[PDB]
Design an enzyme around this catalytic site. Structure first.
Site, PDB file in Angstrom:
ATOM      1  N   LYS A 148       0.831  -1.201   0.000  1.00 37.78           N
ATOM      2  CA  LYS A 148       0.000   0.000   0.000  1.00 37.78           C
ATOM      3  C   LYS A 148       0.868   1.255   0.000  1.00 37.78           C
ATOM      4  CE  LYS A 148      -3.589   2.319   2.624  1.00 37.78           C
ATOM      5  NZ  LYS A 148      -4.436   2.307   3.831  1.00 37.78           N
ATOM      6  N   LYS A 244     -12.619  -8.348 -11.925  1.00 36.99           N
ATOM      7  CA  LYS A 244     -13.376  -9.158 -10.968  1.00 36.99           C
ATOM      8  C   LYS A 244     -14.550  -9.772 -11.742  1.00 36.99           C
ATOM      9  CE  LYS A 244     -12.341  -6.129  -6.953  1.00 36.99           C
ATOM     10  NZ  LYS A 244     -11.141  -5.597  -7.622  1.00 36.99           N
TER      11      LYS A 244
END
Length: 342
Positions: A148, A244
């Site tokens: 991150k 996805k």
């Protein structure tokens, strides 16, 4: 030849081991709708829905999907179909509700395919670098690490690059960067970053930095439909798309999306979102279709108890998947006289 005789709805809701805290939502639990379709031989097939309880991520919710699938079943029950492709025709009309469609397709797929056992690459995710996180990385030896973006990014990359194994580095910037981050983004390009996910909320900011001076750019949050992915690729310098399957409408829509996106010059990574072990299996199954190893989350990462156990067990740098068998005793009826609370 098959006909569908019955439909049942169930709920599962386990706590996240660590509370999920993001700008869009706080989640204590993963509420999830499951469906069960029973054919005319009395064979039951389960589907896992990727919609959430509220619309923090998408307009389709558990409740909206339930109503859509219930109506779909009314419209299609007792209709004969011979093949997988005939079955998929019946969900043509659900294009506009891809989360609902994907849930049904997951069940239909199982009626026509013998499910393999296989492995996929393990990629680790790090939101920072605590001792617990670093020790896990050292022990597990992932072949990719997604880090991150935080103010510590460069100071953390320097620790990771001293780890006794090579890995691909991905950065997740969470639509959080601005013009004051350009200098750092350019420095990051010298660190062999495979791609950076979503540097900017406003994608037009990519036009403000010299092309090729920052890492390759990925869509994740913005990978909302095939058509809008294509629109973004044609306008901006995006090289990687995190797909996805549920966002595309299901398992069956993935290969066509990949072929099309590759024709526009993009590379594809298959990913998921807070899945239980049933959906996680199908995400993993599809991961080899991508240009890079898939973003497949390990068994037990989010949930202590799962509805499908042993779905993505980490062994020697890879995640192992078995044909997924729902533990029916973990599911509860979604509604009605047999929906109990305690």
């Amino acid at each position: 030849s098959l006909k569908l005789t019955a439909l049942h709805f169930y709920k599962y809701s386990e706590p996240f081991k660590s509370q999920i805290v993001t700008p869009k939502v706080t989640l204590t639990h993963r509420d999830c709708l499951f469906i069960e379709l029973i054919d005319d031989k009395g064979n039951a097939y389960f589907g896992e829905c990727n919609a959430f309880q509220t619309d923090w991520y998408d307009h389709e919710t558990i409740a909206s999907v339930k109503h859509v699938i219930e109506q779909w079943f009314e419209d299609n029950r007792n209709k004969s179909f011979e093949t997988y492709e005939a079955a998929l025709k019946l969900v043509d009309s659900l294009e506009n509700t891809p989360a609902a469609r994907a849930t049904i397709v997951m069940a239909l797929y199982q009626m026509f395919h013998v499910l393999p056992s296989f492995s996929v690459a393990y990629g680790a995710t790090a939101s920072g670098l605590s001792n617990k996180q670093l020790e896990s990385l050292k022990a597990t030896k992932p072949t990719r690490i997604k880090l991150k973006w935080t103010p510590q990014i460069m100071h953390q990359i320097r620790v990771l690059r001293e780890l006794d194994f090579h890995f691909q580095l991905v950065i997740d910037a969470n639509e959080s960067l601005d013009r004051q981050d350009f200098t750092q983004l350019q420095l990051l390009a010298r660190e062999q970053v495979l791609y950076i996910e979503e540097p900017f909320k406003d994608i037009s900011m990519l036009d403000e930095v010299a092309d090729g001076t920052i890492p390759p750019i990925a869509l994740d949050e913005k990978a909302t439909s095939l058509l809008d992915i294509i629109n973004l690729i044609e306008l901006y310098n995006v090289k990687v798309v995190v797909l996805k399957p549920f966002r595309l409408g299901g398992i069956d829509k993935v290969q066509t999306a990949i072929d099309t996106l590759k024709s526009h010059g993009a590379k594809v990574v298959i990913g998921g979102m807070y899945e239980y072990g049933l959906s996680r299996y199908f995400t993993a199954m599809l991961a080899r279709k991508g240009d890079y190893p898939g973003d497949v989350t390990p068994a037990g990462y989010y949930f202590e108890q799962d509805v499908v156990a042993h779905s993505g067990i980490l062994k020697e740098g890879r995640l192992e998947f078995r044909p997924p068998l729902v533990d029916i005793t973990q599911l509860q009826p979604y509604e009605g006289h047999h929906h109990h609370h305690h």
